[PDB]
């Protein structure tokens, strides 16, 4: 819900033509201190039946069910967050859970088992900093797919884009105003978008930042006020 | 395309 600022940030960088410079200095835009705490490490699109399951990099798991409710299991193996359609959020546990979440918890379990045995953890080899604690963990607000990508919007404002063909990824964060690019070799770097405007960047990243703008634009216009039917 | 990248971290 910091989508508007992100759009403003992406528009800025794209309008500066970061790849159309005398000398491109992408390396000077790196800022390793801006690495995100959270991103999506795994996902399963079972949207024909039940919903979209995903794992965050801290090993927590979530499901955005088809009825637009969300269930989150923390990495403590016991803590649950349930987020209703309206955004209300309940916090609870697996040991003392309402009988009413039995179906949904069982489904989360099924998603969890599928993803431990067959999916890879994106960004598995990165060492987290002490805390990584906070804040209540993000949940999946919305997601969509294109021919080229899956688009994942988290409740802390981050927008993640996974490109299908080459396995490259963007993690965009609007508060830090930064973007993390995971390349074909799975290497990660974080850039300040404002320094990319300043020093430019390679065509590989620039094209992807242009695609990110159009995708972020699609998110804002989804069920927006101009057209609640989209 | 319907699941993410396959093969074999960390619960
Ligand atoms: Ni039970
Ligand atoms: Ni199998
Ligand atoms: Ni491939």
Numbering used by the authors:
A (entry chain C): 372 to 601
B (entry chain D): 148 to 155, 157 to 159
Copy out sentences from the published article reporting this entry, exactly as the authors wrote them:
One of CSFs, Emi2 (also known as F-box only protein 43) inhibits APC/C activity by binding to APC/C-cdc20; therefore, Emi2 blocks the ubiquitin-mediated proteolysis of MPF8910. Subsequently, the phosphorylated threonines in Emi2 can be recognized by Plk1, which undergoes phosphorylation, and these phosphorylated sites serve as a recognition site for SCF, another class of ubiquitin ligases; SCF destabilizes Emi2 and activates APC/C10. In this study, one of our aim was to elucidate recognition of Emi2 by the Polo-box domain (PBD) of Plk1 using X-ray crystallography and biochemical characterization. To elucidate the detailed molecular mechanism of recognition of Emi2 by Plk1-PBD, we determined structure of the complexes of PBD domain (367–603 of Plk1) with peptides Emi2146–177 or Emi2169–177.
We synthesized two phosphothreonine-containing peptides spanning the amino acid positions 146–177 and 169–177 of Emi2, where two threonines (Thr152 and Thr176) were phosphorylated, and their binding affinity for Plk1-PBD was measured by isothermal titration calorimetry (ITC). The peptide Emi2146–177, which contains phospho-Thr152 and phospho-Thr176, showed higher binding affinity (Kd = 1.73 μM) than did the peptide 169–177 (which has a single phosphothreonine: Thr176), which had a Kd value of 29.58 μM. ITC results suggested that the phosphopeptide 146–177 can bind to two Plk1-PBDs simultaneously (n = 0.47, expressed as a ratio of Emi2146–177 to Plk1-PBD), whereas phosphopeptide 169–177 binds an equimolar amount of Plk1-PBD (n = 0.92, expressed as a ratio of Emi2169–177 to Plk1-PBD). When a threefold excess of Plk1-PBD was mixed with Emi2146–177, most of Plk1 was eluted in peaks corresponding to 60 kDa. These results show that both phosphothreonine-containing motifs near Thr152 or Thr176 can recruit Plk1-PBD. First, we crystallized Plk1-PBD with Emi2146–177, which has two phosphothreonine residues (Thr152 and Thr176) and solved the complex’s structure at 2.4 Å. Although ITC and SEC-MALS indicated that the phosphorylated Emi2146–177 peptides can bind two PBDs simultaneously, only one binding event between the PBD and a phosphopeptide observed in an asymmetric unit in the crystal structure. We examined the structure of the Plk1-PBD·Emi2146–177 complex containing various complexes of Plk1-PBD with cdc25 originated peptide or chemical 4j, and we found that Emi2′s peptide-binding characteristics in relation to Plk1-PBD are similar to those previously reported for phosphopeptides (especially closely related to the Plk1-cdc25c structure). One considerable difference with the previous findings in the complex of Plk1-PBD with Emi2146–177 is that the extra electron density corresponds to Asp157, Val158, and Val159 bound to a negatively charged surface patch of Plk1-PBD (left in circle). In addition, the negatively charged patch interacts with Asp157, Val158, and Val159 of Emi2, which also lie in the conserved region.
